[PDB]
């Protein structure tokens, strides 16, 4: 057979890439506490986690579960972004499969959590000298907090059974203390803006998946191309006829697919392979002639 193998493989699915508002939540004014995290819905946009891993601006980008370069290919349904400020040593507690005080009584995470936890150092975003009397946290609780559940209850923890008149005293501890965020401290009691991404997968179509790389424009080449699922190998020649301004593909009289519209330029292009026939040989006897002749069909 006389076939021509393709040399290039252009892939072009999108036309206008819009990055998700990731810098708005990161470079915001202020957040909240760990027991009352703010849930923000981030969807209807093309995510791109590759611009944040190579930025070299985060303090701890270690993510559990999957690899940091493999989550860009996996598609999700709805991504929830929760932000809270904690201490320096409390960053490792916010991880799937951990237990202690913050991950058991403040914000509990599931064991099989798909998303990871990222954070960065902050010394001017919400830090001040002289102490800190704004951020709070939870200490004890009657029952364990379920994952993905906010806590805004300011009740008094009843440890024992002695009557304390609802005030802090004997067997009546207050699980709402203030943090000691100070820039002159060591590895502990330091404000750290932690943002956890919740990766959820449902039956809804993908809309928050990673980016889709697109190649450059090229025509009049007998190479392979994948135009919106249509995998064809042929010469992308011009077309004098036009299609309707709502279609995408196009058939012909042979009940086959051979015409696709360019999604980057809205130009009708026909598909024409460069493989016709095989190789024919002509031998007018071996004992009478030692010369052959290649024949093309």
């Amino acid at each position: 057979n006389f076939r021509v193998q393709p040399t290039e493989s252009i892939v072009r699915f999108p036309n206008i890439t819009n990055l998700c508002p990731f810098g708005e939540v990161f470079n915001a004014t202020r957040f909240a506490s760990v027991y009352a995290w703010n849930r923000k819905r981030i969807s209807n946009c093309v995510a791109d986690y590759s611009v944040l891993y190579n930025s070299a601006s985060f303090s701890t980008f270690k993510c559990y579960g999957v690899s940091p370069t493999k989550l860009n290919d996996l598609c999700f349904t709805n991504v929830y972004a929760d932000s809270f400020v904690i201490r320096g040593d409390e960053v490792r507690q916010i991880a799937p499969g951990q237990t202690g005080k913050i991950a058991d009584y403040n914000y509990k995470l599931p064991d099989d959590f798909t998303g990871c936890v990222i954070a960065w150092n902050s010394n001017n975003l919400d830090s001040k000298v002289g102490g800190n009397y704004n951020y709070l946290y939870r200490l004890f609780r009657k029952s364990n907090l379920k994952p993905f559940e906010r806590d805004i209850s300011t009740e008094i923890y009843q440890a024992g059974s002695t009557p304390c008149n609802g005030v802090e005293g004997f067997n009546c501890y207050f699980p709402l203390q203030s943090y000691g965020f100070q820039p002159t401290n060591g590895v502990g009691y330091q404000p750290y803006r932690v943002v956890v991404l919740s990766f959820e997968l449902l039956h809804a179509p993908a809309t928050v998946c990673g980016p889709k790389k697109s190649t450059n424009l090229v025509k009049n080449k007998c190479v392979n191309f994948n135009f919106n699922g249509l995998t064809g190998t042929g010469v992308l020649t011009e077309s004098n006829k036009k299609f309707l301004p709502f279609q995408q593909f196009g058939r012909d009289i042979a009940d086959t697919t051979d015409a696709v519209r360019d999604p980057q330029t809205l130009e009708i292009l026909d598909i024409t392979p460069c493989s016709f026939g095989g190789v024919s040989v002509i031998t007018p006897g071996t004992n009478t002639s030692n010369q052959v002749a290649v024949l093309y069909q």
Binding site: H203, A204, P205, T207, L244, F246, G250, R251, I253
Partner: protein
């Protein structure tokens, strides 16, 4: 808010016939001079569908909650834009994610939230006396909203808010399909000029957009509108008006149709394969010029 209406005298609906209606493009692929047979939800020709009316000339204001079926061909002949939007859901009581696609004069708001729907929602248009204008003020659509899953603001579309008593001039063809949780809208506008029944023109509806809301739609209701005047007090009791609008409600059925394409990719003829014995023979033979000779069916 929720302002119910007073029990009034209504009129029984009529029964009209369809003349080649409910035909749209089954796919977004260009075709030319090909005859293919696919399985798509279409409308059977020469069928008796329900004919609803809403003319004030009396006090006709009917809007029942019919169960949403697989494919609904909504053909409304409005000359002054009386029907605003439509509602979709199952119970409609601030318990499930109901779909609300309203077409107000201000803009196109498509919100899929848990809207508390009243017993009989409508739209109130107040008539000002200081200037000859018609602006909408009463928004008795939903009581309140809680959580939301999809909110989109499209381009502003100005509509008419002056109810008249003339003949129809514009035809708004709409098709609502909820298959596998996906809502498909087929919007197509075409000016007409008639007073009753359906036009004999061919149906060629184009798909608008496909929003994967992923909800369960069971019942639906057509939201109408009401107008005010200086001669009436303006209360939502009995002293108001509703103009004149007649919309056709047709349910689609899974029938095999033979689509015909010309040299421009525009469907000009649709031959049904499950209606008349003469039309069933052309679908099997894949032709349109039946001459002499005996043929086989099934």
């Amino acid at each position: 808010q929720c302002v119910n209406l007073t029990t009034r005298t209504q009129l029984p609906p009529a029964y009209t016939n369809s003349f080649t209606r409910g035909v749209y493009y089954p796919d977004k692929v260009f075709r030319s001079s090909v005859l293919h047979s696919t399985q798509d939800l279409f409308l059977p020709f020469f069928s008796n569908v329900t004919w609803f009316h809403a003319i004030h000339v009396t006090k006709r204001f009917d809007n029942p909650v019919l169960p949403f079926n697989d494919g609904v061909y909504f053909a409304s002949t409005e000359k002054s834009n009386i029907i605003r939007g439509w509602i979709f859901g199952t119970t409609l009581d601030s318990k499930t994610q109901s779909l609300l696609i309203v077409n107000n004069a201000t803009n196109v708001v498509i919100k899929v939230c848990e809207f508390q729907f009243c017993n009989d929602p409508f739209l109130g248009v107040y008539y000002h006396k200081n200037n000859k204008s018609w602006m909408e003020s009463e928004f008795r659509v939903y009581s309140s909203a809680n959580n939301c899953t999809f909110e989109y603001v499209s381009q502003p579309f100005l509509m008419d808010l002056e109810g008249k008593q003339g003949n129809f001039k514009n035809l708004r063809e709409f098709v609502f399909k909820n298959i596998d949780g996906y809502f498909k809208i087929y919007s197509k506008h075409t000016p007409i000029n008639l007073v009753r029944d359906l036009p004999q023109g061919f149906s060629a509806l184009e798909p608008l957009v496909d929003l994967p809301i992923g909800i369960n739609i069971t019942r639906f209701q057509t939201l109408l509108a009401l107008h005010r005047s200086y001669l009436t007090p303006g209360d939502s009791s009995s002293g108001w008006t509703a103009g004149a609008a007649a919309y056709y409600v047709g349910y689609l059925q899974p029938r095999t149709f033979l689509l015909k394409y010309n040299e421009n990719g525009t469907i000009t003829d649709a031959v049904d394969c499950a209606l008349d014995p003469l039309s069933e023979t052309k679908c099997t033979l894949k032709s349109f010029t039946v001459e002499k000779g005996i043929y086989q069916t099934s």
